Amino acid sequence: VLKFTTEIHPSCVTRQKVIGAGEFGEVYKGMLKTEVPVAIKTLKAGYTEKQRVDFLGEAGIMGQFSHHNIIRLEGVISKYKPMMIITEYMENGALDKFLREKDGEFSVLQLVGMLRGIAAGMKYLANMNYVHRDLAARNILVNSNLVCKVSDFGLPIRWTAPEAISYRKFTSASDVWSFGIVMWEVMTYGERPYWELSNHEVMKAINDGFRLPTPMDCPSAIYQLMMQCWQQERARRPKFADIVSILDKLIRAPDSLKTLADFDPRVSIRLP
Ligand SMILES: Cc1ccc(C(=O)Nc2cccc(C(F)(F)F)c2)cc1Nc1nc(N2CC[C@@H](O)C2)nc(-n2ccnc2)n1
Numbered sequence: 591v592l593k594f595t596t597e598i599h600p601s602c603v604t605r606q607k608v609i610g611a612g613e614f615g616e617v618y619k620g621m622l623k624t625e626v627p628v629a630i631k632t633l634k635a636g637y638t639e640k641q642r643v644d645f646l647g648e649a650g651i652m653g654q655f656s657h658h659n660i661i662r663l664e665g666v667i668s669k670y671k672p673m674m675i676i677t678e679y680m681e682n683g684a685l686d687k688f689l690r691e692k693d694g695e696f697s698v699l700q701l702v703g704m705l706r707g708i709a710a711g712m713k714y715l716a717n718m719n720y721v722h723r724d725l726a727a728r729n730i731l732v733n734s735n736l737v738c739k740v741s742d743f744g745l746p747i748r749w750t751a752p753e754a755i756s757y758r759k760f761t762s763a764s765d766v767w768s769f770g771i772v773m774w775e776v777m778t779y780g781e782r783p784y785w786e787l788s789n790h791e792v793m794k795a796i797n798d799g800f801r802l803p804t805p806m807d808c809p810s811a812i813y814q815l816m817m818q819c820w821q822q823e824r825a826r827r828p829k830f831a832d833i834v835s836i837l838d839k840l841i842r843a844p845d846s847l848k849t850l851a852d853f854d855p856r857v858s859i860r861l862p
Contacts, residue, residue, distance in 0.1 A: 595650065655720075660715070711738070
């Protein structure tokens with residue numbers, strides 16, 4: 591498992607601030623010498639056998655991935671305690687919070703470019719036979735070039751395909767459903783999917799045939815694509831290769847994004 595990983599000596603790692611929690615240990619922002627900022631997930635004293643298997647196994651799969659749109663593993667501390675998984679760090683942070691804090695600040699082309707990068711990372715994962723299971727804007731990091739990196743921070747009805755909810759069938763095709771939700775999150779600057787509907791109401795709406803409406807000022811082609819990610823029949827959804835191809839072609843012929851889907855207003859204002 592620790593094959594594709596680099597072993598880092600503890601003297602090279604400085605933990606500075608807690609930024610979250612892991613399964614059995616904290617997550618920190620810190621600095622790595624070999625200086626670069628890093629995120630650090632620890633496995634603290636008392637962890638179980640299963641926790642150790644899952645922790646090192648996680649580092650092992652992360653080391654295997656080498657792609658522009660997948661979070662990069664700097665290395666692992668396994669020979670000393672506490673054990674650590676060390677990744678790159680992004681000052682812009684997670685995509686959901688980023689978009690909510692920068693509402694309306696980007697061009698359509700910038701937003702679609704983010705989605706193309708997410709899709710390319712997902713195509714890579716699916717090709718590598720890795721099913722994400724929790725694809726959502728909260729699990730995507732944004733670098734200072736606006737490049738999105740798929741990650742998994744650990745624990746989602748509103749993002750999950752019907753077959754995954756109903757009978758636990760998680761595949762790259764259920765990840766495609768989630769990707770459609772991510773497209774909607776990006777184009778709305780981080781709006782909550784389905785707004786205040788409860789989890790049960792969301793599932794009932796989906797089963798009844800309802801789907802999320804168009805975001806404001808959304809290219810028609812982008813809404814059509816997200817709608818095709820939400821087909822009930824798993825086999826009819828696009829594969830990630832199809833999604834990447836379409837997004838690449840739209841970006842390369844950017845006039846294609848100027849045609850906007852109609853937005854259904856909730857409020858009427860009568861003025862002269
Ligand atoms: C340390 C760390 C460990 C693991 C992962 C991770 O992705 N494993 C993973 C597992 C399976 C599949 C995939 C994959 F690749 F398929 F998607 C990826 C990410 C981070 N790195 C990290 N964790 C956090 N966390 C976690 C707790 C949250 O509250 C904050 N925050 C930031 N961070 C913030 C600003 N710049 C960076 N980085």
